[PDB]
Every structure is written in C-alpha cells, then in structure tokens.
Design a protein around this ligand. Structure first.
Ligand SMILES: Cc1ccc2oc(=O)n(CCCCn3cc(CCCCC[C@@H]4SC[C@@H]5NC(=O)N[C@@H]54)nn3)c2c1
Ligand SMILES: Cc1ccc2oc(=O)n(CCCCn3cc(CCCCC[C@@H]4SC[C@@H]5NC(=O)N[C@@H]54)nn3)c2c1
Lengths: 322, 322
C-alpha cells in the first residue's frame, strides 16, 4: 500500500542494522500499528526480515520482485543515472524507454518483472516470464555521431558479459553482436538502438534480457537445448539485486571506456570473450541465407567473414546461428 | 462541438456541390436545427460557406486553422500515410511524432497551429506562432540502414522546395543541409531524425517548419532582415490547405525517388537549387568556428568545403551561416 516502498527504503538504507517499528513510524509519520501491518505484508510477499523485540527489524534477503523503493537507492547514489522506472508488468521496457526519453535529456533505466510484448531484433518475440529474468532498457546520452552506435554495442557487450561471468561457475561468452552464451545455452540477448539525426545521437536505448532464475523445466521444450540461466551455473542462490548491482557497475565501466577509448583497445579482449571462431556459422540476410566462417573482428568493430564459397565479407552486423 | 468536423467533412467531400441541411442531418443522425447551429459557428470561426435556401451549403474557402475532419480526407485517399494527428497547440509536433511512432509500424504526420516548445537543430528554439506557418512532423518507414539518413534529408529537401516554389513569384533555394530560402529570407527549416539500430531504421521523423502567412511586421525585429514567408512572395492569398496538398504530393514523389534512385541522380538538380556557392560561409563546430567556401556536393551527399586556410573538408552535415 501507500507506504510499502517507504518502509522498504528504510529497511534497506539501514543495513546491517535493525530499526525499530517506532523509528520507522516517525520517519513516515504514520502509526506504530500501521508499520506492523506494512511489515507483515512484505513478509508475506516473500521478504525475509528479522523482527526482534525491543530491537526492531532487519531486512535480511529480498524476493524475486523489483521494488521501486530499493531501486531508488541505486539511483540516488549513482553518477550515471538520473532515475529509474520499475514495473511488475508492462508491454516492453524498450517501448517504455522509447517513450520516456522523448523531450528531455535524462539518463535512466526501466525494469519490469514481466514483459507481455517483449521484442528482440527484427521485431522477434522475446519471452520475458514473470520473476525469472532481468528485463531492462537503459538510456544513456553520449555526445557522439550516429555511426558510433555499433561501437557502443561492442563495448557494452563486454560489460554485460563480465557481470554474468562474475556469477557463473562456467565460461560465459559473447556471440557477436547481440548475444551472450554460457557454453551452449543463450543466457542473454541485448540490442542497442538510438534516436539520432545527422548532428548526433539524441539517446541510446539499450535493451537487455538476461535469464536469471530458470530451470530447463521452465524453458520451452523446442529451445531447451540452447537456452540457459545464470542460476543453472551458480551453486549459490542468485540475488537479482546483488546481480543488478554488478550489472550497473560494469555498464558504467564500459560506458566510460566507450567514450574514452577506441575499439582497437578492447578488440583483443572482445575476441577472447567471443565464441564464434573455428566453427561454421549460418548467416541470414533477408530472403538469402548462407554459411561461412568468422575470420576476424577488425579495429573498427566489423566482422571479417569468409563465406562457404571463399568470398570475404566485412560486416557491421549479421544474425548468426550455430 | 461533437459534430463540427463531421459537418466539415461532408462540406469538403461534396465540393463543388451544395448539400442540404437536411442531408447532413441524416448522415450524422442529428437534428436539422443542430446543423444550422453547427454551421453558424464554423462561419463565425472564419469559414466561408455559401448557404442558399432550398439548395443548402457550399464550403467555399477555409480559415487559417487546421481541421482534423478535413485532414482525414487527405489521409483517407493517400498511399503513403495511415493517419494524422491535428492540434491547435502542442509542445512540439516532433516530440509528439516521437511518442506516437513507438510500438507500431504506422506512417503518419502531425500538424499543430502553434508549437509552444518547438525546437530545431541542436535543440535551438524555433518560433512557431499561431495560425501563421506550417508546423509538421512526418513519420515514414523506409526499410534501409541508418547510414541512409543523410540521403533522405537531401531528397526530401527538393521535395519541400518544389512545393514552396510552386507558390512563389521568386526563386526559392535550398541552403544545405537543413534550410530553405527565398532570396534573403529563411522561409523554412527542416530536420531529419531517426529511430534505428544496426539492423536498420525503425522510423524517420522529419520535422518541417515553413512560414506561410507572415508580414515582416510579424517577424521579430532582430531577424526581420533574414526571415520571410510564402505569402510575401505570392500576390494571391495563400491557402494553407492548397499548400499542404502540394507539400504531401512532393513529399511522396521525393520519398519514392529516395527509395528507388541513388543520390548521383538528383545531385545536379540539388545543385542548381542550392544557394551556398560563390560566397563565403561561416561554419560552426562546437567551440570552433571558421569561414570557407562550398566547392561541391559529392555523389554521396557530402559537401566539399575549402576552409579559409586552403584545406579541403568533406562533410556530411554542418551549420552554415551567411
Ligand atoms: C527468452 C528466450 C530464450 C531463448 C531463446 O532462443 C531464441 O531464439 N529466442 C528468441 C530470441 C532470438 C535471439 N535474439 C536476440 C535478440 C537481441 C536481444 C533483444 C533484447 C531483449 C531485451 S528484454 C528487455 C528489453 N525489452 C525488450 O522488448 N527487448 C529488450 N533478438 N533476438 C529466445 C528467447
Ligand atoms: C521562425 C523562425 C524564423 C527565423 C529564424 O531565424 C533563425 O535563426 N531561427 C532559428 C532557427 C535557426 C535555423 N535552424 C534550422 C533548423 C532545422 C529546422 C527544424 C525544423 C523545425 C520543425 S517545426 C515542426 C517540427 N516540430 C519541431 O519542434 N521542429 C520541427 N534548426 N535551426 C528562426 C526561426
């Protein structure tokens, strides 16, 4: 109700310390027995809080639900982002981000527990089941030319990857240009779009879907061989909030690199992180489809491909299948 | 009121024919004396309709106000556009277009009588006074790469120019890349923006401001030497609706050319239409500013400039001053 996030904010702010019902009640100028009432609900909503008499409450562990209130804490103390929007369900964070950026120069991100109408590249359906993954759009505001998009996409990839890795027992690879894998399962897909004109980019909108807490059971049967989740590669439970934290951390890192360094500078690294070498790839281009091999990513972000018929292409993007 | 546009639609549809109050009343299932009531208002609103007893009404001439109802008639019978939005006042058609395009593949345009917060390039203030100019954003949906924006901007320019010319006694020139002049007055400025990602453009948003019905009196005193309007170069009154008509006509023309022809094919023409040759131009680039001369537009839309210090640049865009 009206005060839930508020209570939550305090519980989060105050860690690893207990706070009294009383104390909360005076912050939010409401009754002591209201606070007891707002707590019990959170607990029922799958919050783990320790209540100790004469001592008060301690927010121990959070459920697989995004709470605005907590997110605000991430936003408050952040160079990069002005604010955030958090939903339990929406059509698409990317759609919402696309609307929210109009007419303003803010930087912000959107998060939703479920997306009812999530879309990937080429307007593909992207499956965004409730409480199971991170579905986020990020808006940043680099002052640069529109051509510079592709570079963003490459830098940001390593960002996302590092974040995922740091929680994975196994090797986490990028599949240029838009996809992250753990061994054989796609664990994430992301996409970098812009509003821009000739004078430069007005905004970057970076959509990111990462499967967090799935069982193969939860994955569709017709894709269950090539999909995975972060949880399936961490012996420890996966705290979405801990993970969101590291995700923003590396986004920032890579965002700054994108601004201050040329692609040549991360190219090697990108390379070692990629999983497309030494195997045969099925490219699509509209009606046409063909196989070929990944020769090299050039100093400019372009992939050097040698098609099955021996011809070299230099490509800025492509959709590749294994 | 509730039925104004409807009456208007009929009046427009039926030209050059009179329609009876009766006939209208049965189309729109309302009372005969309501219709008399809805007409008198339109007349007061500065519509010129002929009412003739036993005969009915003829829509003769329209005021300097955009009516949704009429616009719908343009939209209904049009290959290019799905619908349109019409306002008497909004923050910015470009802003609105930017919102309306999200989550759908429509093609459409927006029109407003006044823009309270209209913006040009580099987020400049653009003055959009009530009932005096055409303030429009167009959204089209070409299937192409984002790089292809600049080409759009060039093609569309000739479109706009032809439209203006056809109503001008005097020579109407383009000032690359974003501005239209009649002799010494800026008569229009336009701007081509996109939402896109690496796989291609998701939408083009083309904002267009054209001064229609100004007196130098109406123009600010500190710009009155370099601003003009279409009316100030037509001895005949300027029908915004007649003009909108020709504008859409040529937009379509040039849109198709943009899709079917390489820039080389209109380059010559663009050239003869341009007004930047044989004089000295002040370019701005951020902090830096310098003079130089326009040597050539290359087959690829880029301007060849020779700066005051003898160095050639090849430029995709620039803001030029006279
Ligand atoms: C869930 C699932 C599991 C296994 C799968 O195996 C598949 O082939 N697919 C179908 C997808 C094919 C691969 N692909 C990748 C991309 C780029 C990523 C798009 C960013 C998405 C983010 S989510 C928050 C934001 N809001 C939004 O609307 N979009 C973005 N596009 N297509 C699978 C889907
Ligand atoms: C009215 C006036 C008269 C004389 C002037 O002399 C000046 O220097 N200026 C200031 C402008 C400087 C030149 N410039 C051109 C451009 C590109 C055009 C932008 C499209 C505008 C359209 S309108 C409907 C749509 N909605 C929207 O918000 N924008 C677009 N940017 N800057 C003048 C303004």
């Amino acid at each position: 109700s009206k005060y839930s996030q508020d209570v939550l904010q305090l519980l989060y702010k105050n860690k690893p310390n207990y706070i009294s019902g009383q104390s909360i009640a005076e912050s939010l100028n409401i009754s002591r027995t209201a606070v007891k009432k707002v707590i019990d609900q959170l607990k029922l909503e799958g919050c783990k809080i320790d209540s100790v008499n004469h001592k008060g409450h301690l927010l121990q562990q959070l459920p697989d639900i995004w709470y605005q209130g907590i997110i605000d804490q991430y936003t408050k103390s952040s160079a990069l982002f002005d604010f955030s929007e958090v939903y339990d369900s929406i059509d698409s964070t990317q759609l919402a981000a696309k609307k929210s950026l109009v007419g303003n120069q803010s930087s912000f991100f959107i998060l939703s527990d479920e997306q009812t109408k999530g879309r990937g590249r080429f307007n593909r359906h992207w499956s965004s089941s409730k409480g199971q993954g991170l579905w986020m759009s990020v808006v940043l505001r680099p002052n640069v030319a529109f051509s510079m998009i592709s570079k963003f996409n490459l830098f940001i990839a390593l960002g996302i990857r590092d974040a995922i890795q740091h929680f994975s027992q196994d090797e986490v690879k990028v599949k240029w240009p838009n996809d992250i894998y753990i061994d054989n399962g796609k664990v994430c897909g992301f996409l970098t779009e812009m509003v821009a004109n000739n004078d430069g980019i007005e905004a970057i909108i970076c959509g990111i879907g990462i499967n967090l807490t799935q069982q193969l059971e939860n994955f569709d049967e017709s894709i269950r061989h090539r999909a995975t989740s972060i949880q399936l590669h961490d012996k420890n439970k996966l705290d979405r909030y801990q993970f969101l934290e590291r995700l923003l951390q590396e986004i920032e890192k890579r965002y700054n690199q994108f601004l201050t360094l040329p692609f040549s500078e991360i190219r090697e690294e990108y390379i070692a992180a990629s999983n497309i070498w030494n195997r045969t790839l099925l490219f699509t281009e509209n009606d046409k489809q063909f196989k070929g091999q990944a020769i090299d990513l050039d100093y400019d972000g372009y992939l050097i491909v040698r098609d099955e018929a021996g011809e070299s292409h230099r490509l800025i993007s492509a959709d590749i299948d294994f």
